[PDB]
Every structure is written in structure tokens, then in C-alpha cells.
Amino acid sequence: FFGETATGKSTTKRLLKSAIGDLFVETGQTILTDVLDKGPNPFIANMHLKRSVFCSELPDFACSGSKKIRSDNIKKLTEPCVIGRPCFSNKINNRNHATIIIDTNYKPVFDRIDNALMRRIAVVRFRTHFSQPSGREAAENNDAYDKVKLLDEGLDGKIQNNRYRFAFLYLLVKWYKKYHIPIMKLYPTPEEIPDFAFYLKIGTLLVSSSVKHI
Amino acid sequence: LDGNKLFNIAQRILDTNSVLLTERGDHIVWINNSWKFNSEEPLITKLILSIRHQLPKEYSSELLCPRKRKTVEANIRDMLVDSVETDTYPDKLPFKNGVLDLVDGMFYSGDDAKKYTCTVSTGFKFDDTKFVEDSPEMEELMNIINDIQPLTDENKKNRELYEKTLSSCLCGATKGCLTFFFGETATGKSTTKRLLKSAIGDLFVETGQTILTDVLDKGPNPFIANMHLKRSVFCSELPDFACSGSKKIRSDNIKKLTEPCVIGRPCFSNKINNRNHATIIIDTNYKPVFDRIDNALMRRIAVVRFRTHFSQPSGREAAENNDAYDKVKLLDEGLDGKIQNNRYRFAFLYLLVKWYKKYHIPIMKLYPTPEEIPDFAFYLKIGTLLVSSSVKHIPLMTDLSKKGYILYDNVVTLPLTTFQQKISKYFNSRLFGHDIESFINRHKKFANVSDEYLQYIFIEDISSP
Amino acid sequence: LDGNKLFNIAQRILDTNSVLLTERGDHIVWINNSWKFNSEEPLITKLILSIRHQLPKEYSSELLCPRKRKTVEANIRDMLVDSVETDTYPDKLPFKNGVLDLVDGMFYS
Amino acid sequence: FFGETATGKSTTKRLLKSAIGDLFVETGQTILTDVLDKGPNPFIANMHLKRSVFCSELPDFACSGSKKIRS
DNA sequence: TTTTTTT
Ligand SMILES: Nc1ncnc2c1ncn2[C@@H]1O[C@H](COP(=O)(O)OP(=O)(O)OP(=O)(O)O)[C@@H](O)[C@H]1O
Ligand SMILES: Nc1ncnc2c1ncn2[C@@H]1O[C@H](COP(=O)(O)OP(=O)(O)OP(=O)(O)O)[C@@H](O)[C@H]1O
Ligand SMILES: [Mg+2]
Ligand SMILES: [Mg+2]
């Protein structure tokens, strides 16, 4: 979930949480930046049999000393069984049923880039701003916003009371019927992240040597 | 003469040989035509309740009360004072309701399967109806296998090695080397892994990479503990070592994994010894590297190459240009669903049985292939081409001085200038200059202030001119 | 010649397929149209107390005392020897009091 | 035991192991260069009441960076 | 370059 400040990603997360109850779970950034199988890792353990996992507030990697995202973690986070150990336990097999969503303000940075990682990334953008009456004019001069609206202060509390729970559940069911009825599958979108585009364009400009060129 | 009734009941239970004590201190029971052991479950009480029927009619009423069952369990645990050995037959396959003999193909059940003390099982019942050679599912499986590994004159050796490695997982002996599944994206390694897991049931296991990077004797380690008495161990997604921060695979762990017994302890249990009966498969798209190189290390490494790409219809043209692929086919989007529902379990079992009956019946052994690792290639090239000196070179001493090997201090002394000129004209400098410098600085010696030497005579110089 | 009353009660409880054993080693019970499991709570005793009503009236009085419930739980634990697999349907949404079928939208309780 | 390869060292080791049964034990060269007071050391408990401790396949001291076997 | 975890 990539976008600027005050674009509604958090509201979407809260709506989904209120809709799907405790099947939703939020987990820190350790799972993307360290070894999962060393020592007790309750963050991995709590991911067992969950249906949606959220990781939020990705730091900017331009800052010095900030560790980058590891490719092996992403590869390990897509197979049906993820190896992890709870505290005071020895079971090391967890069933992976969860859709993993990350809320970030900056583009991700990976240490190593290859096709295998390239086929496991999708990005959706938010380009609307919910501002205050005072800051209405300032937002008009930003290219990161395609629309500007007025903030609603009392909306958040209404979400806390589960006012839009069953309506959102019905909408989700309708969307699931619309899309995933034949078969469920997710399609990568590598043409968004910049370095991926560099890899694509460098790949398409060369052809491997063969006997036909002799 | 009629003493304690519970003692007599326990004696009768012990007389049928259904409870046994292992060497390391485990109790194994015989329930539902299978040997089971579980330290967190009251298996002895379950066995007592189950075999209550076989006892005379005057004992079931006593056995119905749980306290009497506890007393009988205590008596039984007290009587037995001897250990036994288990899993002494490497050519048997244990199932949930019997044991299959891989030699004759006959399937045993009941007491016949009891004589072989197999403490692990595939976890599912063996069905003879589906264990047939002619079936549409078998044809589909054969087509898929041919698609993944085409049978050609170029791929015949690779396919033979692949078949041997896959069939090795059935036997319960100790394997001398592990196998690397190397390939590109969407090549079929995961499909093979899932098919093997579905075929062999509970005998399959997957663990983390910590076994190849960290020590094993420090503290409890359930990852090693779960490996005990397993038939196949799988690990995946080895990180690229080109980037900084990657940790090399320690050869000490590789040496320790090739031993019949392995150290490691679970939580809240003082069980430190485990039997190594498993074939280790590491699948990755990056060739591994190691800190140290020696003959004993590359004598236990094998590599299998996957070179068939299953791509999207839109990506067929792009994949065709890439040289890493030899065949580009379509992308079946329903294969994973069928595999997960065990649509090819018994067909794969039959195919593996045939492969075992074609390769491993005379003798089980695995042969390493150290000619594919880039790190081992340079060291092997030294070993084949560059040889050291010995006392047998005394008759050649005159020619040795002619080329430069002076017998200072009763040892050959070839100047490093001549030696580096030789290696530069033979060993290409640009490819492995750093490795050549490491060779020079490793076994460096000086005869005197201006006679720096290495006691290695290149093979055209060992030949008498 | 009927034997232990508690054993008969435990057999009757087991015959309803309300408690099952999972391959991970935890027992799952069926209370209030839901499957529950917890490694730190005695769910078996809760099941025994809750489903006491449907049993014949000569057994509820026995089921009142906690010691009898503990003995019945011991019998039930002794009788369970098999394992089953859970969560094999990827298109059902489970709630606190039923399961919703995503294919049709029908709700089963 | 210093000598050429395939000179019978492995044969003698196997003969000694078969002669003394479980009294034989094999340990790596790490303890020869590592600190024995740090961390758990089940190896130190291993050669207790033993009769033969074998350290074989020693690293090449010629290799740069190899840890010297502390006296 | 150990601490917590584990008994
Ligand atoms: N449709 C809407 N109309 C009015 N106000 C809205 C609307 N959607 C969201 N808001 C409000 O606008 C504010 C900004 O939303 P929010 O904080 O979720 O944005 P964000 O970009 O996800 O933020 P961050 O990434 O910093 O968490 C919130 O107070 C939210 O309640
Ligand atoms: N014979 C076949 N025909 C068509 N599709 C196939 C065939 N065999 C396998 N596939 C499909 O190929 C897809 C990719 O295979 P798989 O995931 O095993 O590749 P991989 O190279 O091991 O992947 P990665 O290394 O990225 O994990 C699977 O979804 C599977 O359905
Ligand atoms: Mg927000
Ligand atoms: Mg794969």
C-alpha cells in the first residue's frame, strides 16, 4: 500500500479488521529483516492459520544504517509452510493461509534483485488527500495528490463502533464472487518499482548468443 | 498362589511383547498394527484399554477403572529392565496398516509386520487397488515428469542421477552425501518437492537453514530433534552469497550431517542422540560457497540441474531468448490443486518403487559430482594438473636444477618467479588471480633470501626430459 | 452385566463425535456451534458439563461432581487413539455461531 | 600421527576403535583453538571416563588466517 | 560483539 500522508490506508486497514474480526493480525518488521528460524519467534508463531497479516510504517532506506529488505525472507514467506518456533514450544511448522499487506510511505529497497523475487511483488497506489481547511491551498501544489477533499473528524469513532462491519462484509463477499469464483490467483506488477523496470529494459534489449548469428 | 491381581494382569500384558524399551529410554507400544512412541501421551494406558479384550473375562472390569490402569502401568514400567534395537531393516517401508517389502513387493500386516520394529510410518493406509501400473493418473504423472526432465542424449545422465536421488529416499540406511537442486525460476523444483512429500507422507520433513550456518551443540535445538529417524529432509531458499552480509556454509556442519548419529536435544527432554536415516535436499537458484575447501568436503557434494521453463503465454517470447532455459512450455494453473488433494500419491509411489527396483537392489551408494561447483573447480584443476614433490624425484634432480628446483636443505626449491610464470602460462590469471595469490601465500616458503620456493612440480616437469 | 457407570457415560460422550484429536497434539471440542481449542484450559470438562442435558437423567447427577468429570475426561483421553486433519475447505467463512458458504451465500448452523 | 596419505592411518584408527569398543571417541580441532570456559561444552563431558580421544583431519597451518593451536 | 529462553 503505497501513498502519501492522509490518503486512507489506515482507514482501509481498520475497515478490514472490523469486517473480518480476529482473523486479521498485525506483525512488526522483524519478519522482513532478520532470520526467522533462530530462537523463539512469537511474531512468526502468531501468523499460524491467519487469513490476513499487516505490516505497517516501513522506514526510509535512504538513511544510513537502515537495513534493507532481504530476498530470502520474501521467498520464504510464499510457500505453504513457514518455519518458526513459538516460545516454550518445539513445533516448527505453521500453515500459511494469510494475505500479507505492507503499508509504506517510500518505495521498498531490496539487497538482491532477480526474476524469482520479481514475480512475487504487487503494488497499489493511493492518490487522494484528506486535508484540513487551512491546508487546502498547499495540497493543490503537490503532484502526489490527484484530488483533495475535506477531513471528517467523527468518521474514525464510527469505525471503532463497527458501524460499517456487515456492509463491508457484504461488499467483500460480492467482490469475491466477482473475481475468485473460477480460481483464485494473484498477478505480479513489476512494471512499477523502478529498478525492476531497469531489469526489464536491460533484458529486452539483448538476445543470447546462438549459432543463428554465425 | 493367587497374589496381586493387578500384578498378574501386568505380567500377562508383558508376556505378549507389546511394550518395548528403546536404547535411549523410550517406550514403544503396538497399537492398530503399528509401533508408536510419544513422550507427551499416555500410550501405555491406551494399550491396556485396547487389549483389555484379549484378557480373560475376570479382568476387564478391573481394567475399566483408570486408577487400576495407572497401577498396572506402574507395574509394567517397573518390570522391564532391558533395551532393544529398532529399525534394523533398511529395505522395508512402514505404512499405517502394514509394512511393504521392497524386495519382493509383498505387503505384510498384523503379526507379520510386527517382527520388523519400525517406529515411524508414512501416516496413511496402503491401498492395493490404486497401487497399479496402468492408470490415467499414472500417464499424466509420466507426462509431467517427462516435461520437467526430458529424456534426451544430453539429459540422460542428469535424468538418471535425478531418478537415483529421488528413489534413495525410500531406504532407511544412512546416506553419504546430500543433493543440491539448482535451477532458475518456474523450473519445477517446488512441484517435485510437493510430489515427493505427498508420496512419502510423514517420512518427509523440512527444516530451516540454521543447520548449515550455526553450531548444533549449543542449547536445545528442536530443528535437529525433528530430523531424527526421518527419511527425507528438505531445505529451501538459500540467500545469494555475492552480496555482503551473507554467511557461508560451514564444512564442519556438512561433515557432522554425514554421520550415522547426530547430536541435538529437544525442549524438556534429555534425548541427545538421533539416528540419521535421511537424504538431504537443498533447493536454491544460487550455487553455494564454503569457507574451506578440501577433498573430504567435495567427496560428498552432488548437484542436479533443472532446465525447463513453464511460462505465461505472454512471456513465451521473452523466455525463449534467455539461454538459461532449454524448453519453454505452457503454465498449468490447476496442477497445484490436484497435487494438494493427493491425485498422484500411489502413482508416484509405484514409479519410485520401480526406480528402486532398477537401481538400488544390488548396493546402496551415492557418488558425488564435484565438477559443477565453481569454487571446487579451481582446486580440482590444481589437484589434477599441479602435483607436489616427493623423495622419488631424486633421479630427476639434475633436470629439476635445470628448470630451477634446487635441492636446498634436501628439498626441491623452485623460485616463485619461475613458478608464477608457469602458472600464468597455464592457469589463466584473469579468471582466478585472487585464488592464485591465495595459493602462493598459503604454502609459501623461502629457501634463502632470494630462493623463495614451493615444493610443487608441474606435471610436464615431473616427466623426465 | 454393565460395568462402570462413568465408563458408559464416557462412551456415550465419545459416540457423538464432539471431541477430536489433531495431528499437532491438541484436542478440539464442539461447544456452541464452534470448534474450540486451548492448551491452557480444560475444554473437555466444559464439554462434559455443557452436554450433560441430552444424556439420560441418571447421569446428570453424576456429572455434577467435578471429580466424576475428571475421571470421565481421563477415560475419554484414554479412548482417543486416532488423528484427523482440520481446515481443508478454503471457501468457508467460520463465525462464532455457524459457517458461511462463499459459493452460494447460504449460512449453516 | 604425521605421514603420507593412505599409509594405514585410517586402518589403524579403525583397528583401535574395534579393539576398545565405546572407549574410543572422535572430536574436532575447534577445542584446540577455542575458549573452553565460554558457553556449554558437552564435548568436555564426552571424553570423561574415556580411553582414546582422536583429533583427525587437522587444518592446514599453511593456510592464511588459520587459528594456531594454542599451547 | 550476551543477553532471554529454559529447567
Ligand atoms: N472519505 C473520507 N472522507 C473524509 N475523511 C476521510 C475519508 N477517508 C478518510 N478520512 C479521514 O482522513 C484522515 C486521513 O486518513 P488516514 O490517517 O487513514 O490516512 P493515511 O494516508 O492512511 O495515513 P498514515 O499512512 O499516516 O497512517 C483520517 O482522519 C480519516 O478518518
Ligand atoms: N508439466 C507441467 N506443465 C505445466 N505446468 C507445470 C508443469 N510442471 C509444473 N508446472 C507448473 O509450474 C509452476 C511453477 O513451478 P515451481 O513453482 O515448482 O517452480 P520453481 O522453479 O521450483 O520455482 P521457484 O524456484 O521460484 O520457487 C507451478 O505452479 C506448476 O503448476
Ligand atoms: Mg492513515
Ligand atoms: Mg519453485
DSSP for B229-241, written as a single string: T-SEEEEE-PPPS
Q: Return the sign of the alpha-carbon dihedral for residues A130, A134, A138, A140.
A: positive
User: In angstroms, how far is E6 C1' from A39 CA?
Assistant: 12
Any idea what DSSP says for residue A211?
A: G
Where b means 16+ CB within 10 Å and e means fewer, B190-219 reads bbbbbbbbbbbbbbbbbbbbbbbbbebbee
Can chain B be said to touch chain A, i.e. do they have 3 or more Cβ pairs within 8 angstroms?
A: yes
Give the residue from B276, B311, B90, B77 showing the smallest Cα distance to B186: B311
Which residue's CA shows the smallest distance to C1' of E2?
D39
Give the residue from B203, B141, B212, B129 showing the smallest Cα distance to B168: B203
CB atoms within 10 A of CB A201: 9
Nearest atom of ligand 1 to the alpha carbon of A156:
31
SS3 assignment, position B462: helix
Q: Which nucleotide is nearest to D39 (CA to C1')?
A: E2
Helix or strand (DSSP H, E) at B222: helix B222-225
* Residue B463 burial (C-beta neighbours within 10 Å; 0-12, 13-18, 19+): exposed
Q: How far apart are CA C35 and CA B119, in angstroms?
A: 32
For ligand 1, mutation pick of A103, A104, A130 (most atoms within 8 Å of CB): A130
Contact in structure between A89 and A45 (CB atoms under 8 Å):
yes
Contact in structure between B33 and B110 (CB atoms under 8 Å):
yes
SS3 assignment, position A18: helix
- C5: closest CA of chain A, how far (Å): 38
Q: How far apart are CA B50 and CA A148, in angstroms?
A: 73
**β-strand partners of B437:** none
Q: How far apart are CA B163 and CA A81, in angstroms?
A: 26
Would the CB atoms of B32 and C81 count as touching at under 8 Å?
yes
Q: How far apart are CA C79 and CA C17, in angstroms?
A: 12
CA A48 to centroid of ligand 3, rounded, Å: 27
Torsion of CA B286, B289, B295, B301, to 10 degrees: -30
Taking the alpha carbons at both ends of chain A, their separation in whole angstroms is 49
Q: How far apart are CA A49 and CA B272, in angstroms?
A: 32
Helix axes B5-15, B66-79, angle to 10 degrees: 60
Method: cryo-EM
On chain D, the residues whose CB falls within 8 A of the CB of B218 are 39-40
Contact in structure between B266 and A85 (CB atoms under 8 Å):
no
Residue A181, chain C, CB below 8 Å: the answer is yes
Q: How far apart are CA C94 and CA C73, in angstroms?
A: 28
Strands (E), B320-384: 328-329
Contact in structure between B254 and B300 (CB atoms under 8 Å):
yes
Where b means 16+ CB within 10 Å and e means fewer, A34-45 reads ebbbeeebebbb
Residues 6+ apart with CB under 8 A from A173: C102, C105
Contact in structure between D23 and D52 (CB atoms under 8 Å):
yes
Give the residue from B62, B63, B81 showing the smallest Cα distance to B14: B81
For ligand 2, mutation pick of B141, B181, B190, B281 (most atoms within 8 Å of CB): B190
Q: Which residue has the cell 468518521?
A: A155
Would the CB atoms of B444 and D62 count as touching at under 8 Å?
yes
Q: Which residue has the cell 492518490?
A: A127
Strands (E), chain A: 2-3, 24-26, 52-58, 81-83, 93-95, 99-104, 125-126, 129-131, 148-150
Contact in structure between B19 and B62 (CB atoms under 8 Å):
no
Torsion of CA B95, B101, B103, B106, to 10 degrees: -110
User: In angstroms, how far is E7 C1' from B25 CA?
Assistant: 20
Q: How far apart are CA B159 and CA B157, in angstroms?
A: 5
C-alpha cell at D40: 556449554
**β-strand partners of A83:** A93
Would the CB atoms of C25 and B40 count as touching at under 8 Å?
yes
Strands B279-284 and A52-58, bridge-based pairing: unpaired
Any idea what DSSP says for residue B249?
A: B
Question: How many Å is the Cα radius of gyration of chain B?
Answer: 30
Backbone phi, then psi, for B179, in 5-degree steps? -125, 140
Any idea what DSSP says for residue D53?
A: E
* Residue B64 burial (C-beta neighbours within 10 Å; 0-12, 13-18, 19+): middle
CA B335 to centroid of ligand 4, rounded, Å: 13
Nearest residue of A to residue C89 by CA position?
A97
**β-strand partners of A58:** A104
Residues 6+ apart with CB under 8 A from A169: A19, A20
Q: How far apart are CA D52 and CA D22, in angstroms?
A: 10
DSSP labels, A84-136: ---TT----EEE--PEEEEEESS---BS---HHHHTT----EE--EEE-STTH
Backbone phi, then psi, for B376, in 5-degree steps? -70, -20
On chain C, the residues whose CB falls within 8 A of the CB of A173 are 102, 105
Nearest atom of ligand 1 to the alpha carbon of A3:
21
Q: How far apart are CA C51 and CA C43, in angstroms?
A: 12
CA B311 to centroid of ligand 2, rounded, Å: 9
Give the residue from B75, B81, B66, B77 showing the smallest Cα distance to B9: B75
C-alpha cell at C69: 468429570
Q: Which nucleotide is nearest to A85 (CA to C1')?
A: E5
Length of chain B: 465
Would the CB atoms of A114 and B285 count as touching at under 8 Å?
yes
Residues near ligand 2 with C-beta < 6 Å?
A 116; B 144, 147-148, 183, 185-191, 285, 310, 329-332, 335-336
Residues 6+ apart with CB under 8 A from B391: none
SS3 assignment, position D34: coil
Ligand with an atom nearest the CA of residue A7? 1
Option in A49, A95, A173 nearest C102 (CB): A173
C-alpha cell at B323: 539461454
Q: Which nucleotide is nearest to B265 (CA to C1')?
A: E6
C-alpha cell at C82: 486416532
Q: How far apart are CA B157 and CA B161, in angstroms?
A: 6
- C22: closest CA of chain B, how far (Å): 13
Task: Give B285's Cβ-side CA count (13 Å radius).
Answer: 19
Q: How far apart are CA C88 and CA B66, in angstroms?
A: 35
Question: How many Å is the Cα radius of gyration of chain C?
Answer: 16
Would the CB atoms of C25 and B32 count as touching at under 8 Å?
no
**β-strand partners of B446:** B452
Contact in structure between B436 and B382 (CB atoms under 8 Å):
no
Residue A17, chain B, CB below 8 Å: the answer is no
Option in D30, D40, D57 nearest B218 (CB): D40
- A173: closest CA of chain C, how far (Å): 7
Strands B232-236 and B204-206, bridge-based pairing: parallel
DSSP labels, chain C: ----HHHHHHHHHHHTT-EEEBTTS-EEEE-SSSEE--TTS-HHHHHHHHTTTTS-HHHHHHHHSHHHHHHHHHHHHHH----B-----TTEEEETTEEEETTT--EE-
Any idea what DSSP says for residue A141?
A: T
Q: How far apart are CA B195 and CA B220, in angstroms?
A: 32
Torsion of CA B285, B287, B289, B293, to 10 degrees: 150
C-alpha cell at A123: 503494488
DSSP labels, B273-334: EEE---EEEEEESS---BS---HHHHTTEEEEEE--EE--STTHHHHHH-TT-S-EE---SS
Q: Which residue has the cell 572422535?
A: D26
Q: How far apart are CA C13 and CA A166, in angstroms?
A: 37
Residues 6+ apart with CB under 8 A from C2: C8
Q: Which residue has the cell 519382493?
A: B104
Residue B218, chain D, CB below 8 Å: the answer is yes
- A15: closest CA of chain B, how far (Å): 31
Which residue's CA shows the smallest distance to C1' of E7?
B268
Residues near ligand 1 with C-beta < 6 Å?
A 3, 5-11, 130, 149, 151-152, 155-156
Q: How far apart are CA B183 and CA B284, in angstroms?
A: 7
Q: Which residue has the cell 456429572?
A: C63
Would the CB atoms of B222 and A85 count as touching at under 8 Å?
yes
